Amino acid sequence: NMVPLNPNRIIPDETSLFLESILLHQIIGADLSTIEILNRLKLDYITEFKFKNFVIAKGAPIGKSIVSLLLRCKKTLTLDRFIDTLLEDIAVLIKEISVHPNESKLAVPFLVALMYQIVQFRPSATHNLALKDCFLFICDLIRIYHHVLKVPIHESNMNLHVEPQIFQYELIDYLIISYSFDLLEGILRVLQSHPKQTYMEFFDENILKSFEFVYKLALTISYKPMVNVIFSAVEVVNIITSIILNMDNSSDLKSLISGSWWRDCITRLYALLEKEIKSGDVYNENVDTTTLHMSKYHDFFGLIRNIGDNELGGLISKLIYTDRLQSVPRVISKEDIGFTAPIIGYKMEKWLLKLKDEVLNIFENLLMIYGDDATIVNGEMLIHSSKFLSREQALMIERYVGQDSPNLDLRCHLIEHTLTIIYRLWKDHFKQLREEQIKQVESQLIMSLWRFLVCQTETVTANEREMRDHRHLVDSLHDLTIKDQASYYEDAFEDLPEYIEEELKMQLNKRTGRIMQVKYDEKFQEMARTILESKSFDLTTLEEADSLYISMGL
Amino acid sequence: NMVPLNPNRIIPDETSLFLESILLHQIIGADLSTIEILNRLKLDYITEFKFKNFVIAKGAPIGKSIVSLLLRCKKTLTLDRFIDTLLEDIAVLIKEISVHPNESKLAVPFLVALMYQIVQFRPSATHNLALKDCFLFICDLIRIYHHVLKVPIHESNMNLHVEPQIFQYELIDYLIISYSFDLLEGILRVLQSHPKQTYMEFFDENILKSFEFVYKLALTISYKPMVNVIFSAVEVVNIITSIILNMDNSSDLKSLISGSWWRDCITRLYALLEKEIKSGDVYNENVDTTTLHMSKYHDFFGLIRNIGDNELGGLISKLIYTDRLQSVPRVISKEDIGFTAPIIGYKMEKWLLKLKDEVLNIFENLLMIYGDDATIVNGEMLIHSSKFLSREQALMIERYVGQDSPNLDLRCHLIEHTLTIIYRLWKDHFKQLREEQIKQVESQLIMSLWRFLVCQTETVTANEREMRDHRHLVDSLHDLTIKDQASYYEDAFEDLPEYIEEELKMQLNKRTGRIMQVKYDEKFQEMARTILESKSFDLTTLEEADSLYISMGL
């Protein structure tokens, strides 16, 4: 029962493959190799630099200067060692490219992507200090590039849009800001994946409700919060939750934040969630502070979310002449980038519904973080979560049902989860709610409850024969799902083992009859029941209750 | 007494090593890195070029096309496989880059720098099929440049040297031809260093005919000789000798070779060897077919032999702009290249000494090759070897000793070895000598013999004083090196353990006495004695020998 050794071992070294992988690397969307893009870069208006046996001549091959340093330090350093060394070098490089008046920043955004790749390739048993060094350096690069996110609510009467239309420098700084935020994101993601003992080693002064303005400049209330950076800062908030929920003395780690900063966070989280989702113009600009509508003048993946069209990347290729060592990028029409099929739009709408998912997940994570009471907690925020549930019940029943479009699946599973959200506050959390809050809104909550209190008719389908018609009427998109997914996807979708086709003819009921806000699982009705029919507060006394009961039949 | 395992090395993969080494190589002399030199290459007058998933656009990055092919085929092939794949691709490349009317060949030589770095890199189990593919391809490449090594015997009264004065395409084709013959050298010696099993499978009469074309082209008897190609070609002859002395039944390869071709080689060896060494104008042009003058036109190392000033090295760098993808080389002056210190001239005296070492060394080798006789076996070896012995005896004593320059040490070790050559003749090959030959030159052989028969006085040393005086007279330069060596560059040249201070004194005694033309080895004189004082031929009966005996004393 012994097991022997493997004699075949020809192990490709970590650094060799790393080095090459970066050399030829290709980003999603463009044409040309990463380092090789780099080989057509020259840093002119700064005629020289030197930091650490790292000369660059005036008209030097930045590229061959990059790969130069890389390869040369190759036979010097080791995996993690070469990592932190290049991080510091290219970081200093960023700073050099940063503080200069006439300098163009073309190179900068390519280097940020390079660093992401690096830390993403092999983030093993490293140490945070390097991460923090880059991290702070780039947050305050962002305070160097703070001249972006807090541009106004909108135009003036005359903040003219007559323009050089240089998406070039727009995409420049958008890549910059995004990519950089995305740094924040990812290097934190590996702070989000270091040995859990070092969650406290990720502590930073900028992370303590500061980082220049960071989150403030991001989720503006007087400017345009932009879906990318929106994602970013809110993700950082998620990072805070993350550090909250992983090490036993979470109490210590939580102590860092300033109370006002908790507030400045969760408040603008509310301000996020009480915006809206309308595929009508998700891809044009409209009423502000309300429409997470990702204008075209930026639309690509982002460095870790393969979101959609990436109607940019090919223009990343376009950026360089790919044949001449150059400093300023190639022109792009701000408008040529982007009625064929709103299906790409509908898939990113399912991704905006995934964003509402993560927003509710962050609110549930905030609930988890709050073991006791908080100053940031409004108290009636539980009723405000039920207010969100009530809108996506009324307007659910009234609009998005009957529209043969897969957005329904999450537009329902969302509030199916908000059930868990509220059901958490069934009783265990009923010791802070000022009566002020519960009766400032007596109207909405009972509606939230009575939604399943009237759903508990529990007597609609009991079979298929009627309701296969229900499905046929609009669920045809879910039929596209069933047909493509069973056609050539998975293995539990082909050869149905004589019980999952029965699960078809029933689960299909329980999902397609589950479109129009009707017939929710015995948990749903009983989770709401164990909350309402318990008289822990005077919502439901019979002298004002059988009007509901008689409304149920009874 | 076991020794434990040591597998915990972080082993650099052989393929990865090869890759990175090529990727950053810089050659001996220039300023720039191989692959990036490559990165400054465009192949223009061939607007498309393509052989095997190896597209290159018109103005495309040659160099990036390399690194592309390199890296892609990396995660394809193993070591040897990556070799042969390159070899085929680059071979097709070179072939067409050759066969083209308006094409300039800039890339070709630099790719030939590739050729070297590559094929040299690991010749361990490489197969002769690939070797010969490259090989023939380059020999007939050479016959595509056969328009070089047979340029006339001298500049005619009408032939002008008014010029575009470019050293460019001269150095271009010079590198080409040389580097190519240098291929011939390197790959053929990887043949000789392959296992003896993989030998005859490569040798066909095609080798004889193709190399016969090139040799005839090269060691001209009716044009300008050209020292580098002179080198290369003759060592290929040495390669023939090598396969002879190595194949246990070398009769196979010998029968392969043609009698006319042995003749057209050994005869041109005679043409080479009866030239002369004159450091007076080793660096200008004089009586031809007699002086191996390595002019600046082709003066660098050569892809092995680090001969000296290598004065072309950095001018290799100056060939590319090292800033822009380009097709035709950057200009160089034909004359700026190249009274300060003729110590370089004397480095070369030592080297051309190593060359005449090669002359006598190959002639020795063929000597031992033909234990049985042959057709080119003719005795003119006896004639001319003894002849060279005579001339470097007489002119030795009248000119070269006493000139306080360490050339004489090797200049004499030469003929001290030719002693072994002739003594080999005496032991073995005295069953062919023609009366024709012995009485065409009764003169020079007896001269040679009596040169040490008059030396055999054996009556010099008797003390230290006179010989140390001789030393102070002549051995000045030899002691410059002796003291550089004892004071700079040796473990043994400190802490003499009291049994070698006498070694110092008497060894310097013997070396200085052996410096001044006199009292050569007891082995020398008795081995020569066993030839003359033995009466195997009627050179020396007493009736006509005692006049020399009395002319020695006796």
Locate B7 and state its tokens. Answer: 């597998």
CA distances from B163 to A193, B146, B157, B169, B338 (A): 70, 22, 15, 12, 19
What distance in Å separates the CA atoms of residue B116 and residue B121, rounded to the nearest whole number?
8
What distance in Å separates the CA atoms of residue A231 and residue A178, rounded to the nearest whole number?
10
Distance from CA of B82 to the nearest CA of A (A): 15
Per the CB < 8 A criterion, the answer to whether B332 and B47 are in contact is no
Phi and psi of A117, rounded to 5°?
-40, -60
Resolution (A): 4.7
Amino acid present at A449: L
Q: Determine, for residues A19 and B20 on separate chains, whether the beta-carbon distance falls below 8 Å.
A: yes
Locate A286 and state its tokens. Answer: 């409209």
Residues in B touching A33 (Cβ below 8 Å): 64, 68
- What DSSP string runs through B385-418? HHHHHHHHHHHIIIIITTSS-THHHHHHHHHHHH
Amino acid present at B420: T
DSSP conformation class of B514: T
Residues 6+ apart with CB under 8 A from A443: none
Count of residues in chain B: 554
Check if B12 contacts A (Cβ < 8 Å). Answer: yes
Mutation for B interface: A16, A17, A18, A40, most B CBs within 10 A: A16
What distance in Å separates the CA atoms of residue A6 and residue B6, rounded to the nearest whole number?
15
Label residue B346 exposed, middle or buried (CB < 10 Å: 0-12, 13-18, 19+).
Answer: middle
Per the CB < 8 A criterion, the answer to whether B226 and B149 are in contact is yes
CB atoms within 10 A of CB A479: 15
Q: How many helices (H) and strands (E) does chain B have?
A: 22, 0
Place of tokens 């265990």: A428
Count of residues in chain A: 554
Per the CB < 8 A criterion, the answer to whether A228 and A292 are in contact is no
Mutation for B interface: A14, A39, A66, most B CBs within 10 A: A39
CA distances from A262 to A7, A360, A459 (A): 57, 17, 46
Locate A45 and state its tokens. Answer: 């208006």
Check if A317 contacts B (Cβ < 8 Å). Answer: no
Instruction: Using alpha carbons, select from B123, B120, B131 the residue that is nearest to residue B21.
Output: B120
Residue among A10, A12, A325 whose CB faces B323 most closely: A325
Per the CB < 8 A criterion, the answer to whether B297 and B11 are in contact is no
Residues in B touching A324 (Cβ below 8 Å): 324-325
CA distances from A526 to A366, A419, A523, A530, B11 (A): 25, 11, 5, 6, 63
DSSP conformation class of A134: H
Please tell me the experimental approach by which this structure was elucidated. cryo-EM
Label residue A66 exposed, middle or buried (CB < 10 Å: 0-12, 13-18, 19+).
Answer: buried
Q: Determine, for residues B71 and A20 on separate chains, whether the beta-carbon distance falls below 8 Å.
A: yes
Per the CB < 8 A criterion, the answer to whether B186 and B135 are in contact is no
Check if B6 contacts A (Cβ < 8 Å). Answer: no
Helix (H, G, I), strand (E, B) or coil at A140: helix
Distance from CA of B36 to the nearest CA of A (A): 8
Helix (H, G, I), strand (E, B) or coil at B3: coil
Instruction: Using alpha carbons, select from A395, A445, A440 the residue that is nearest to residue A422.
Output: A445
Q: How far is CA A245 from the centre of its chain?
A: 19
Residue among B72, B74, B323 whose CB faces A59 most closely: B323
Place of tokens 């890389």: A70
Instruction: Using alpha carbons, select from B11, B14, B128, B124 the residue that is nearest to residue B79.
Output: B14
Check if B10 contacts A (Cβ < 8 Å). Answer: yes
DSSP conformation class of B545: T
What distance in Å separates the CA atoms of residue B265 and residue B261, rounded to the nearest whole number?
6
What distance in Å separates the CA atoms of residue A347 and residue A478, rounded to the nearest whole number?
14
Annotate B391-411 with b (16+ C-beta within 10 A) or e (fewer): ebbeebeeebbeeebbbbbbb
Per the CB < 8 A criterion, the answer to whether B325 and B61 are in contact is yes
Place of tokens 């539980």: A382
Helix (H, G, I), strand (E, B) or coil at B22: helix
Check if B36 contacts A (Cβ < 8 Å). Answer: yes
Per the CB < 8 A criterion, the answer to whether B553 and B484 are in contact is no
Residues in B touching A322 (Cβ below 8 Å): 61
CA distances from B57 to A37, A63, B49, B72, B88 (A): 17, 21, 7, 18, 20
CB pairs A-B closer than 8 Å = 57
CA distances from B81 to B15, B87, B88, B183, B254 (A): 10, 10, 11, 20, 33
Label residue B488 exposed, middle or buried (CB < 10 Å: 0-12, 13-18, 19+).
Answer: exposed
Instruction: Using alpha carbons, select from A227, A294, A224, A236 the residue that is nearest to residue A264.
Output: A236
What distance in Å separates the CA atoms of residue B273 and residue B386, rounded to the nearest whole number?
13
Per the CB < 8 A criterion, the answer to whether A175 and A109 are in contact is yes
What distance in Å separates the CA atoms of residue B54 and residue B65, rounded to the nearest whole number?
8
Per the CB < 8 A criterion, the answer to whether A261 and A208 are in contact is yes
Per the CB < 8 A criterion, the answer to whether B488 and B481 are in contact is no
CA distances from A331 to A336, A430, B218, B389, B490 (A): 12, 60, 56, 78, 65
What distance in Å separates the CA atoms of residue A508 and residue A493, rounded to the nearest whole number?
14
Residues 6+ apart with CB under 8 A from A533: A540
Q: Determine, for residues B11 and A13 on separate chains, whether the beta-carbon distance falls below 8 Å.
A: yes
CB atoms within 10 A of CB A139: 23
Q: Determine, for residues B64 and A24 on separate chains, whether the beta-carbon distance falls below 8 Å.
A: no
Q: How far is CA A206 from the centre of its chain?
A: 21
Instruction: Using alpha carbons, select from A542, A347, A537 the residue that is nearest to residue A445.
Output: A537
Residues 6+ apart with CB under 8 A from A366: A241, A266, A269
Give the DSSP H/E element, type plus range, for residue B471. Answer: helix B465-474
